[PDB]
RNA sequence: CGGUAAUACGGAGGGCGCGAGCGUUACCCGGAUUCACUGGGCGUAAAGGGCGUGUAGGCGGCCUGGGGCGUCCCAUGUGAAAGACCACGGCUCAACCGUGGGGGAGCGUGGGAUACGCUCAGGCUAGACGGUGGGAGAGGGUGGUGGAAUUCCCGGAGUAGCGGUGAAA
RNA sequence: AACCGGAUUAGAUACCCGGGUAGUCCACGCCCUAAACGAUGCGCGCUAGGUCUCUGGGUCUCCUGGGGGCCGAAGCUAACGCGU
């Protein structure tokens, strides 16, 4: 059925990058949405978008590297080094405004569900609202 | 003048004896062989002949590395037919990497230059004539094109990357660019300016090598014929 | 560490560390991410249940709408004193003391938000199940039947041994 | 298995030889253990390939499912290894 159909997508991400694939599907769903356009405005990703593959909508996910790097291995540098669900179903995570995590000193980011909406940890602080620790970001 | 002179015989080559990331260049699979896009072969070929102008003009140094049958003979021409070092025979270790100390095996080579007409031409305890005029042997055999090499070269080209892995894997160590004529087994990502090609087909090894080699003269004026180098074709 | 050259025992010289103390023993936290929530593991190191069926329980696909229980925000009430913390001060300093300030989870009250989780009401077909057609199989249970071989019984024929072991008995 | 003999051996409650009861076989009911081993719990998604093979389907040098094996990308592991 699938358990997680976020942290499958924060995966599916992850396992397609450490080959260097070009692009990614993952099943589309509204809330999925909402993550990758943080993901694309924050710089990790070139860009998503809505494609039907097999009759049935998916999220063609374009990922993005870095340049072709000197010595023995010449493998790119991850944009994404790091993407980490943190609120899975087994244990649900809230933070409040005042207990938001700052990934990173601040190079990284914190995608971050509330009723204002699916926010970077930033753009929430701002806005000072919590809500459910989605996964982080670097 | 290139366009059909490659897809004379020169395209395509290995079968399924290959390395999905070469999928990128590669056109189609017919009868059981794998065919290799050559609109991709030229988007390269350029981008890598001009390479070799911005550090041939620059009087670079290129050392060639060719040890297939189809290749060694047709290595010591285009090389020799250039000033530029070669490998033909068998590639040692350390020949980039242990470098200083390979080369005091030239240092100890060409002290029987001297001694081939020296006073010590006719003499000296006649077993010792045979054994050190036929250690040069071994030297001449595997350093011909080697002796040259008096520096680090700046470049590295490689006719086939997975037969010469070896070679190559010491030149990324030294970050070495790493220039290669590569087929269906090689991985083009330690290739750093591809010649997408046919590293078997005699015609191919030429047809590409000698053109590369133009360019190197080219880049310092006094072009000549279709070169020294058609082979024992057939 | 000690068995005749002991920087490890006992002593002396010297030196190191503390100092009206210095050691010892007991106990608590630490280091110990060595019960791991933060923060661990299970092929061979300790560690996958002998295998299933499915009870309670945990967990749940894509779209929409209602409710606002989880969750989040604002205000407000509570959070005594002492203590801890920051300042300034009073004993010649300090220990001790005084005055003032600052926070805070948690819970109550009123208001508000709805992305996620929950719930209610509809939808959808990618999960699951089913339909029709086709397939391989020492999967199980019951009855039945076949040839080879061993042992025994009966007959023929035939004679001084067979058997067994490293060799024998 | 046991036990009764014969050997062997310094001894030989053994290994070898000759016998031999329970048992192994069946019916019914118990017992519930094991190196009950892939020493690897179940399910699902994702992440190069080559090769051998069992069993389907298809346009039948190949493709496409479902099994059984080996080598091996990325990665993992203390290593050995593991690696659709």
């Known amino acids: ?138 | 003048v290139k366009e059909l002179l490659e897809a004379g015989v020169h395209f395509g080559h290995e079968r399924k004896r290959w390395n999905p990331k070469f999928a990128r260049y590669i056109y189609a699979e017919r009868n059981g062989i794998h065919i290799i896009d050559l609109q991709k072969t030229m988007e390269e070929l350029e981008r890598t002949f001009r390479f070799i102008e911005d550090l041939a003009m620059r009087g670079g140094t290129i050392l060639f590395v060719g040890t297939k049958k189809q290749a060694q003979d047709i290595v010591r021409m285009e090389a020799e037919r250039a000033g530029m070092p070669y490998v033909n025979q068998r590639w040692l270790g350390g020949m980039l990497t242990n470098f200083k100390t390979i080369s005091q095996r030239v240092h100890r080579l060409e002290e029987l230059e001297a001694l081939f007409a020296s006073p010590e031409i006719e003499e000296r305890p006649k077993k010792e004539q045979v054994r050190l005029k036929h250690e040069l042997e071994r030297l001449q055999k595997y350093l011909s094109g080697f002796r040259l090499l008096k520096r680090l070269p700046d470049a590295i080209f490689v006719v086939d990357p997975t037969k010469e892995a070896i070679a190559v894997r010491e030149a990324r160590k030294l970050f070495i660019p790493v220039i290669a004529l590569a087929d269906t087994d090689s991985d083009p990502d330690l290739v750093d300016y591809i010649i997408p090609g046919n590293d078997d087909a005699i015609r191919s090894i030429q047809l590409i090598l000698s053109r590369a080699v133009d360019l190197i003269i080219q880049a310092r004026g006094g072009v000549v014929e279709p070169s020294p180098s058609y082979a024992l074709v057939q």
């Not at chain 1, 990922?63 to 991850?78: A, C, I, M, T, V």
């Not at chain 1, 994404?80 to 207990?99: D, L, N």
């Open chain 1, 1 to 138: 059925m699938l358990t997680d159909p976020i942290a499958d997508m924060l995966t599916r991400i992850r396992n397609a990058t450490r080959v260097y694939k070009e692009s990614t599907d993952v099943p589309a769903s509204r809330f999925k949405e909402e993550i990758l356009r943080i993901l694309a405005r924050e710089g990790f990703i070139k860009g998503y978008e809505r494609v039907d593959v097999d009759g049935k909508p998916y999220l063609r996910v374009y990922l993005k590297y870095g340049p072709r790097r000197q010595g023995p291995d010449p493998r790119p540098e991850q944009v994404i080094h790091h993407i980490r669900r943190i609120s899975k179903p087994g244990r649900r995570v809230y933070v409040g405004v005042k207990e938001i995590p700052r990934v990173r000193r601040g190079l990284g980011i914190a995608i971050l569900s509330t009723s204002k909406g699916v926010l970077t940890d930033r753009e929430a602080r701002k806005l000072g609202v919590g809500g459910e620790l989605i996964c982080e970001v670097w």
